[PDB]
Amino acid sequence: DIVMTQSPDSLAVSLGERATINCKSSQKNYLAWYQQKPGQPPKLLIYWASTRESGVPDRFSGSGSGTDFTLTISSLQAEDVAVYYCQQYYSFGGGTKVEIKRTVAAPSVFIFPPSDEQLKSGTASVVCLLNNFYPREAKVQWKVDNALQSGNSQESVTEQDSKDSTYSLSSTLTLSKADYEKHKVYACEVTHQGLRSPVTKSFNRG
Amino acid sequence: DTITLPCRPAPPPHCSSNITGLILTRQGGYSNANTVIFRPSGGDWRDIARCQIAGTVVSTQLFLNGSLAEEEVVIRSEDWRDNAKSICVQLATSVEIACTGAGHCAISRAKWANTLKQIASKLREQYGAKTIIFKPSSGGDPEFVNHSFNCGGEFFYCASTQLFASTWF
Amino acid sequence: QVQLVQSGAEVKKPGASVKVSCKASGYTFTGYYMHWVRQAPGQGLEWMGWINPNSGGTNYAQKFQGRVTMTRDTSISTAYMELSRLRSDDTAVYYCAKISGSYSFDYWGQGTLVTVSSASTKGPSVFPLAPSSKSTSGGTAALGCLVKDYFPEPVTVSWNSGALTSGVHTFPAVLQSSGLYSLSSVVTVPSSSLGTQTYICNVNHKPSNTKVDKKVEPK
Ligand SMILES: *[C@@H]1O[C@H](CO)[C@@H](O)[C@H](O)[C@H]1NC(C)=O
Ligand SMILES: *[C@@H]1O[C@H](CO)[C@@H](O)[C@H](O)[C@H]1NC(C)=O
């Protein structure tokens, strides 16, 4: 029982370009490669390191021997976006998520104060929306009367848009009604490589 | 002392045999605490038949009245790296198992511990470990979770728990 | 054709026990070992152990020794996985998988989501994310719905009963520290449409029989 290490953990490839995934064991060749899409079990692509399962397009190939092994997609298609796992004996690799690489799109940033309906219930949720950006990496920081917040927000990211290949992100700052009514300025500051400098959207409660 | 195994039904005294080998499964998962656990085989008759040390008597877990090794205890496997392939252990010195006829079979505790120590030493060198733990069966049907054997047209089931419960550094 | 059909999703309290089944068809059931692999949401694949259908012998990964029990019934070609003393980090999709002669898994069950939680079934409250001048970058205005404090998953969100799909984003639910989920659904629309076009987010939560049609209004 060995450890399979997959590199890289995430791989963004332009349409039509070559994708290579590497997998090495910490120790013939019984390596298998699998493709997993959302809501579905893994699907066997390659076994015996290089033998292709039936019905599996030619653009998938594997190679390697001993301890180094490679999966290659020679011409990436939109349908090949998935997570790929290697497997040797009953040890799985950590997975490699394969996505479409596109040019940089800066997020459009919106902030939403809590609704009056919510304030009657006892809590207050402020929502920051970063819409249609690429790539995924983005830093959202909540500031309340210039005080950086910690441990009171949660983030959620969409999967890559099938149409334009961007991501969206929503961060929610959750405060009790009391804490919310004892401060004035709420702001989310967004950092993303598509922006010359970080962007702050804010509002004054009231 | 004496390790007594309960058997159902009671084996007659003439069913006393010599243990010539056994068949083990290596416990999967990680742990990676520098220890390797072994249990009696979680396989079936294919695992047993492919050891090629059986003899005429049909048995599980332990080989009765089978082939003995030439000099040292010798272990074999179709693939050491596949915890689904069993590990055939062939003894060089048989261990007598005496059936009294009252419903239990007895083996000498000293003879068994010395056999396990030699098995552990051969297992220790094959898996490059430091600690070898023997644990009882993981479960299964009665013929395989027990040490079961054929004698005189009757089938016997003996609990082997007390035989696989030791640690060896 | 080989088919592995597993039992339905389950919700269980911490410390209980779940018993997942997996019915095999199209091949000699006793001829191949059956493995169990689980996958925490958004995580990798974790092998749990194998079972020999011919003998019932098993070999569990050391993590699950004492908690896991694999059995099978050859007369109905069904394999069983039972996990006991459940914790929250046992929440995962559970798969049976049939090994092949190439030591690969060519056939998998469809998966069995097992959620471990102390929460009770609760329908969501849905609050508007109102379009304002603070959500008007353009040109474009953003508006939405906050679907808060529900259990279990999932909720479904649509806008104007399917007549508004362009520009919609519905985010994956986050698990709050209360044990209840919440998510957001947002849409970008022309700011000239505010005042002439009505926007209604339609929220359904089957397990609680909740249906809400919330009208999102400017300011
Ligand atoms: C074990 O082997 C010895 C020598 O081959 C033999 O005399 C003895 O009877 C055997 N034990 C049994 C229980 O048959
Ligand atoms: C093993 O050998 C002994 C001596 O020949 C014999 O009496 C005994 O029946 C054999 N074991 C079995 C299980 O038949």
**Between A and C, how many residue pairs show a Cβ–Cβ distance under 8 A?**
125
Under the phi-then-psi rule, with left for phi > 0, alpha for psi from -120 to 50, and beta for the rest, what region is C182?
Answer: beta
- The domain containing residue A39 runs over which residues? 1-101
Count of C-beta atoms within a 10 Å radius of residue A54: 6
- Indicate if ligand 2 lies below 6 Å from the C-beta of B17: yes
- Are A107 and A171 within one domain? yes
Query: Which CATH number does C119-219 carry?
Result: 2.60.40.10
> Other CB atoms closer than 10 Å to residue A158's CB: what's the count?
17
Between the CA of B88 and the centroid of ligand 1 the distance, in Å, is: 22
CA A170 – CA A158 distance, rounded (Å):
9
C-alpha–C-alpha distance, residues C82 and C7, integer Å:
12
Chain B contact for A90 (CB, 8 A cutoff)? yes
Residue in the block written with tokens 């059995």: C71
Torsions phi, psi of B162, nearest 5? -70, -10
Q: What φ, ψ does residue A90 adopt, rounded to 5°?
A: -110, 35
Residues A36 and A89 in one domain: yes
Task: Provide the residue ranges of all domains of chain C, joining segments of one domain with +.
Answer: 1-118, 119-219
Residue A1 near chain B (CB below 8 Å): yes
Closest CA to A88 of A46, A35, A38, A41: A46
End-to-end CA distance of chain C: give it in Å, rounded: 58
Cβ pair B140:C52 closer than 8 A: yes
Hey, do C1-118 and C119-219 end up sharing a CATH topology, with the first three levels equal? yes
Please tell me the distance between residue B12's alpha carbon and the centre of ligand 1 in angstroms.
Answer: 16
Distance (Å) of CA C132 to CA A50, A108, A180, C194: 57, 15, 20, 10
Asked whether B160 and B146 are in contact (CB, 8 A), the reply is yes
CB B63 within 8 A of CB B55: yes
- Distance in Å, CA B17 to ligand 1 centroid: 7
CA distance B144 to B62: 10
Calculate ∠ Cα C31-C33-C34, nearest 5°.
Answer: 120
Same domain, A141 and A89: no
Q: Which atom of ligand 2 is found nearest the CA of B149?
A: 13
What residues are paired with C105 via a beta bridge?
C99
Ligand 1 and B18: CB distance under 6 A: yes
State the amino acid at position A39 in one-letter form: G
Cβ <8 Å between A111 and C50: no
C61 contacts chain B (CB < 8 A): yes
| Dihedral over Cα of B41, B46, B47, B53: its sign | positive
**How many domains does chain A divide into?**
2
Q: Same structural domain for residues A129 and A199? A: yes
Sequence-distant contacts of C61-70: CB under 8 A, at least 24 apart: C61/B28, C61/B29, C61/B30, C62/B27, C62/B28, C62/B29, C62/B30, C62/B31, C62/B37, C63/B29, C63/B30, C64/B29, C65/B27, C65/B29, C68/C36, C69/B139, C70/C34, C70/C36
B88 lines ligand 2 (CB under 6 A): no
Do residues A169 and A151 share a domain?
Answer: yes
Q: Residue B165 is encoded by which pair of tokens?
A: 């419960």
Domain end (from A101, A124, A143): A101
Examine the domain organization and report whether A78 and A128 are in the same domain: no
Instruction: Kindly report the nearest CA distance between residue C130 and chain A, in angstroms.
Output: 7
Q: Which two tokens stand for residue A36?
A: 């997993």
The resolution, in Å, is: 2.4
- Report the alpha-carbon distance of residue A179 to residue B71 in Å, rounded: 81
The reply to whether A81 and A11 lie within a common domain is yes
Structural domain boundaries in chain B: 1-169
Is residue A121 classed as helix, strand or coil in its secondary structure? helix
Cα–Cα distance measured from residue B42 to residue B145, given in angstroms and rounded to the nearest whole number: 8
Q: Please work out whether the CB of residue B86 comes within 6 Å of at least one atom of ligand 1.
A: no
Whole-number Å distance between alpha carbons of C39 and A113: 37
Q: The domain that contains A175 carries what CATH number?
A: 2.60.40.10
- The residue type at A124: A
Dig out the tokens for B89 from the structure: 């252990």
**In the CATH scheme, what is the homologous superfamily, with its name and number, of domain C1-118?**
Immunoglobulins (2.60.40.10)
Burial class (CB in 10 A: 0-12, 13-18, 19+), A97: middle
Residue A31 amino acid letter? L
